[PDB]
Amino acid sequence: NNDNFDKLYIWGVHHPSTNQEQTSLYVQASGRVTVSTRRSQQTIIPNIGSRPW
Amino acid sequence: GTLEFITEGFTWTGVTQNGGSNACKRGPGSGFFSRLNWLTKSGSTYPVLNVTMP
Numbered sequence: 363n364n365d366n367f368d369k370l371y372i373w374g375v376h377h378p379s380t381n382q383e384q385t386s387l388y389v390q391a392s393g394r395v396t397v398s399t400r401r402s403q404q405t406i407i408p409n410i411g412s413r414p415w
Numbered sequence: 416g417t418l419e420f421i422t423e424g425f426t427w428t429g430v431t432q433n434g435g436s437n438a439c440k441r442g443p444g445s446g447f448f449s450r451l452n453w454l455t456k457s458g459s460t461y462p463v464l465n466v467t468m469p
């Protein structure tokens with residue numbers, strides 16, 4: 363951020379319903395997403411399961 | 416303002432229900448919390464459970 367203002371970044375992380383779907387899309391059995399700045403840090407590990415339709 | 420509990424028939428297939436530990440003894444033998452259900456292995460399987468209740 364070389365600008366003179368705060369930048370807000372919206373991002374997310376996908377939670378598949380089945381392992382089959384997890385592998386179709388991202389190969390690895392279990393994913394992981396880690397977004398970080400010099401002073402903060404944040405890490406989500408997607409959970410696989412059925413939610414309501 | 417109430418602990419009015421209503422049981423529903425969840426159907427937990429492929430797992431053994433009603434486990435309890437000697438920490439939580441009910442009467443002579445051993446038991447568990449009354450409104451919770453300790454699901455453990457059956458045979459040597461724990462299926463991926465997937466129930467729903469509208």
Ligand SMILES: *[C@@H]1O[C@H](CO)[C@@H](O[C@@H]2O[C@H](CO)[C@@H](O[C@@H]3O[C@H](CO)[C@@H](O)[C@H](OC4O[C@H](CO)[C@@H](O)[C@H](O)[C@@H]4O)[C@@H]3O)[C@H](O)[C@H]2NC(C)=O)[C@H](O)[C@H]1NC(C)=O
Pocket residue numbers: 379380412413414415465466467
């Ligand atoms: C974990 O349990 C989940 C919870 O029920 C389960 O998902 C259910 O699966 C059925 C699959 O068809 C879906 O039901 C939908 O219901 C709405 C209500 O009106 C319908 O609009 C729609 O109807 C159709 O589906 C028919 C056949 O499957 C088809 O013939 C019709 O043409 C029409 O397309 C939906 O079916 C939901 O996916 C879902 N219900 C709920 C409440 O979540 C899920 O399978 C299970 N997970 C695993 C891994 O087995």
